[PDB]
Amino acid sequence: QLAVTFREENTIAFRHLFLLGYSDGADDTFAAYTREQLYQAIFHAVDQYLALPDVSLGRYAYVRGLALCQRYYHMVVTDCIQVDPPESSYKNLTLKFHKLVNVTIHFRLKTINLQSLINNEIPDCYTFSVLITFDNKAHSGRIPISLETQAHIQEC
Amino acid sequence: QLAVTFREENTIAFRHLFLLGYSDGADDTFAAYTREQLYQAIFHAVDQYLALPDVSLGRYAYVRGLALCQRYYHMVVTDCIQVDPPESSYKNLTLKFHKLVNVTIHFRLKTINLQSLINNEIPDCYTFSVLITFDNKAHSGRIPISLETQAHIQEC
Amino acid sequence: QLAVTFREENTIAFRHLFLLGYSDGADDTFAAYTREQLYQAIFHAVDQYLALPDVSLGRYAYVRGLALCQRYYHMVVTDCIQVDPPESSYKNLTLKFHKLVNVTIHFRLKTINLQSLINNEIPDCYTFSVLITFDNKAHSGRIPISLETQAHIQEC
Amino acid sequence: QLAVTFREENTIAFRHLFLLGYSDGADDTFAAYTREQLYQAIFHAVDQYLALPDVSLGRYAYVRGLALCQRYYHMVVTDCIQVDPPESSYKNLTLKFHKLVNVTIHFRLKTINLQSLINNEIPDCYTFSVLITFDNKAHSGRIPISLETQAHIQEC
């Protein structure tokens, strides 16, 4: 097994949790091909974000919420929707398919790294910035889906 | 990620949309083994062609329609059926299994390449000629299925 | 695509048709792990043999029928059941699991190689001897399943 | 096919039987990402252990039973549950998710190696010690699942 960073280990879990149908090894081919697929993917991610406390194996805290934005041509216009846990009202989204540039879902998760316990140390803090992108910049009929993260580390 | 041409990017989307059960990396093994599979595959492709506007993530225009042909031994006889969107009457197809040479579904899709917008340029036009082949020339009990395209580019 | 013989092309179709859940590239790992799986596999193969005319994309003729045998310890005892198309009475099979050596399904399919037509030649004849084996000789709790063939060629 | 030991052949069967959704080649990526998945996995393993006689293709004898333990932070506390075939009362398990270190399912299976018969020899005895681990020591939101075994061999 190849070693990765703590953030990366967490990120793999994030891909399984937020990306519908995701499976290991499909990172650079994972994509959407229909409107329904793109809708299900977006909703699944948000639903999962809202259900996180009752399903995740990790212990992530929200950091207020979630921004669902879609960028399309009117000039590029960004159109964002806010989702404040604890749960909805956003399932009436209408994608500007013909004008679509991309769609992004952005949110942050806060957590502790418990590996410190084995060495009798107070765990330090990790705040993950999650960005899920449905990229349509190639306007090719194929929209690749990706999830990347960035971590802010500091003592709690 | 390996770069491919615009036509090729579009073609990958076409394989996911028109080939039933298709999945990346199965291009040279993708095939049919039963009559039902061959029937479902053909119908799925045509149905998808008819539903294109309500499902595709790309913006393809029809170019009048779709030709469903089957070639079999009487001398090789070609037997074509026309499908003019916007939708049917062709689901009563009867495949000459024992005589079957192949079956092809041919149609063209017209679209614009919006990548021009980022450089403030008028998009040029692409007309894709789609050919789906169910090849039975080996008469081996295995019919490989393939989708290939050709593009006609010009200013709109 | 790697060239194989006509028999081999046909054999690939046979694996898709008679082996339940079979998929390309799983030939040397394909196996059964439960009694139900082993029962479903055996029945699926026989059912498929009986339905062959209404489902196969090839044109295979029976050569009278099908022998379902199981070998187990009493000395190794072979216990065969006959299936004469056109269809049953064999679904009451009781596998000597604890004593099981293996199980084999044997039958022959006769057909013509139509590739001759393109060169205006009378097709020669192929008689395939199909042998499906559920090997339990390792008595390891894992029974690998395999299908192999042999061809008898001659003018019709 | 690569040769492995008798124990290893048996172990592969054990992975297919006790690990939910397991498939060949996924050994070092196989993991759980949700509470429900972790619950289903644990229950599936135990249920399978209890049903073993009616489903397995091997002939394994119990060696009294099965220990379902979970380790979590109060200091690391181990909390075990006993399952004595022939069947339950353990499906009311409550996982200390936030405190979870790991979870292990331990049991032993006894059997004979019938390969001796082909050489007219009395089979020797194998007692497999099975250990299924749901490792959460990385506290990364991803819990890798693994099954390993050890064998005690001796004349019966």
Element (H, E) at C42: helix C35-55
Selected for mutation to probe chain D from A18, A20, A57, A128 (highest D CB count within 10 Å) is A57
Query: Which residue is associated with the tokens 């406390």?
Result: A53
> Is C141 in contact with D58 (Cβ distance < 8 A)?
yes
Return the bridge partners of D126, or none: D111, D153
Which residues of C sit within 8 Å Cβ distance of B? 1, 6, 9-10, 12-14, 16-17, 24-25, 54-60, 113-115, 117-118
CB A95 within 8 A of CB A69: no
Give the CA diameter of chain D.
57
Distance to chain B for A81, nearest Cα, Å: 21
Determine the Cα–Cα distance for residues A7 and D105; give it in Å rounded to an integer: 29
Q: Which of A29, A97, A140 sits opposite B9 (nearest CB)?
A: A140
Determine the Cα–Cα distance for residues A26 and B85; give it in Å rounded to an integer: 35
Determine the Cα–Cα distance for residues B115 and A75; give it in Å rounded to an integer: 13
Q: Is D78 exposed, middle or buried (0-12, 13-18, 19+ CB in 10 A)?
A: exposed
Report cis status (omega within 30 of 0) of the bond before A86: yes
Determine the Cα–Cα distance for residues D104 and D113; give it in Å rounded to an integer: 27
Straight-line distance from the first to the last Cα atom of chain D, in angstroms, rounded to the nearest whole number:
30
Name residues whose C-beta falls within 8 Å of residue C122's C-beta, 6 or more positions apart in sequence. Answer: C116, C155, C156
The values of phi and psi at residue A44, to 5°, are -55, -45
Residue A14: list chain D partners with CB under 8 A: 141
Determine the Cα–Cα distance for residues C52 and C44; give it in Å rounded to an integer: 12
Residues in chain C: 156
A44 SS3 class:
helix
C74 SS3 class:
coil
Breaks (C-N over 2.5 A) in chain B follow: 64, 74, 87
Determine the Cα–Cα distance for residues D62 and C121; give it in Å rounded to an integer: 66
Breaks (C-N over 2.5 A) in chain C follow: 64, 74, 87
Which residues of A sit within 8 Å Cβ distance of B? 28-29, 32-36, 38, 73, 97-98, 136-143
Tokens at D37, concatenated: 């998945």
Name residues whose C-beta falls within 8 Å of residue C106's C-beta, 6 or more positions apart in sequence. Answer: C66, C67, C69, C129, C130, C131, C132
The neighbour count for residue C95, using CB atoms within 10 Å, is 18
Query: Which residue is associated with the tokens 């225009």?
Result: B61
Ordered DSSP codes for chain D: -----HHHHHHHHHHHHHSTT--TT-TTT-EE-BHHHHHHHHHHHHHHHHHHHHHBSS-PEE---EEEEEEEE--EEEEEEEE-S-----TT----TTTEEEEEEEEEEEEE-GGGGGGT-PPPEEEEEEEEEEE-TT-SS-EEEEEEEEEEEE--
Put residue A89 in one of left, alpha, beta given phi > 0 → left and psi -120 to 50 → alpha: left
> Is B38 in contact with C59 (Cβ distance < 8 A)?
no
CB C59 within 8 A of CB B64: no
Selected for mutation to probe chain B from C15, C57, C149 (highest B CB count within 10 Å) is C57
Selected for mutation to probe chain D from C140, C143, C145, C146 (highest D CB count within 10 Å) is C140
CA angle at B127 for the pair B125 and B128, rounded to the nearest 5°: 140
Chains that touch B (3 or more CB pairs under 8 A): A, C
The values of phi and psi at residue A41, to 5°, are -65, -50
Q: Which of A1, A55, A118 sits opposite D36 (nearest CB)?
A: A55
How many residue contacts between A and D have a Cβ separation below 8 Å? 55
Element (H, E) at A31: strand A31-32
Name residues whose C-beta falls within 8 Å of residue B65's C-beta, 6 or more positions apart in sequence. Answer: B82, B83, B84, B85, B107
The values of phi and psi at residue C118, to 5°, are -60, -20
Find, among C56, C70, C61, the residue nearest to C128 by Cα.
C61
Determine the Cα–Cα distance for residues D113 and D126; give it in Å rounded to an integer: 7
How many domains in chain A?
Answer: 1
A26 SS3 class:
coil
CB A129 within 8 A of CB A151: yes
Q: Alpha-carbon Rg of chain A, whole angstroms?
A: 17
Distance to chain A for B22, nearest Cα, Å: 12
> Is A57 in contact with D33 (Cβ distance < 8 A)?
yes
Determine the Cα–Cα distance for residues A24 and B61; give it in Å rounded to an integer: 36
C10 SS3 class:
helix
Cα–chain center distance at C87: 16
CB A108 within 8 A of CB A127: yes
Determine the Cα–Cα distance for residues A142 and A37; give it in Å rounded to an integer: 11
Find, among C83, C78, C96, C10, the residue nearest to C48 by Cα.
C83
Find, among B142, B35, B99, the residue nearest to C53 by Cα.
B35
Name residues whose C-beta falls within 8 Å of residue D105's C-beta, 6 or more positions apart in sequence. Answer: D18, D42, D45, D46, D49, D66, D67, D68, D69, D130, D131, D132
Beta strand B76-83 with B125-135: parallel, antiparallel or unpaired?
unpaired
Q: Alpha-carbon Rg of chain D, whole angstroms?
A: 17
The neighbour count for residue C121, using CB atoms within 10 Å, is 9
Name residues whose C-beta falls within 8 Å of residue B47's C-beta, 6 or more positions apart in sequence. Answer: none
Residues in chain B: 156
Q: What is the 3-state secondary structure (H, E, C) of A80-126?
A: EEEECCCCCCCCCCCCCCCCEEEEEEEEEEEEECHHHHHHCCCCCEE
Determine the Cα–Cα distance for residues A61 and A111; give it in Å rounded to an integer: 6
B65 SS3 class:
coil
Tokens at B80, concatenated: 């074509």
Put residue A144 in one of left, alpha, beta given phi > 0 → left and psi -120 to 50 → alpha: beta
Tokens at D69, concatenated: 């333990």
Which residues of C sit within 8 Å Cβ distance of D? 28-29, 32-36, 38, 73, 97-98, 136-143
Tokens at B2, concatenated: 């390996």
Determine the Cα–Cα distance for residues D60 and C39; give it in Å rounded to an integer: 20
Q: Is D130 exposed, middle or buried (0-12, 13-18, 19+ CB in 10 A)?
A: buried
Q: Which domain holds residue A118?
A: 1-156
Distance to chain B for A36, nearest Cα, Å: 7
Determine the Cα–Cα distance for residues C20 and A86; give it in Å rounded to an integer: 46
A11 SS3 class:
helix
Q: Where are the beta strands (DSSP E) in chain C?
A: 31-32, 61-62, 66-73, 76-83, 100-112, 125-135, 143-154
Tokens at B14, concatenated: 């076409």
Find, among D140, B27, D24, the residue nearest to A109 by Cα.
D140
Q: Which of A9, A55, A114 sits opposite D142 (nearest CB)?
A: A9
Q: What is the 3-state secondary structure (H, E, C) of B103-120?
A: EEEEEEEEEECHHHHHHC
Determine the Cα–Cα distance for residues D156 and D148; give it in Å rounded to an integer: 24
CB B97 within 8 A of CB C57: yes
Determine the Cα–Cα distance for residues A13 and B37; give it in Å rounded to an integer: 36
Determine the Cα–Cα distance for residues B93 and B80; give it in Å rounded to an integer: 10
> Is C36 in contact with D16 (Cβ distance < 8 A)?
no
> Is D38 in contact with A57 (Cβ distance < 8 A)?
yes
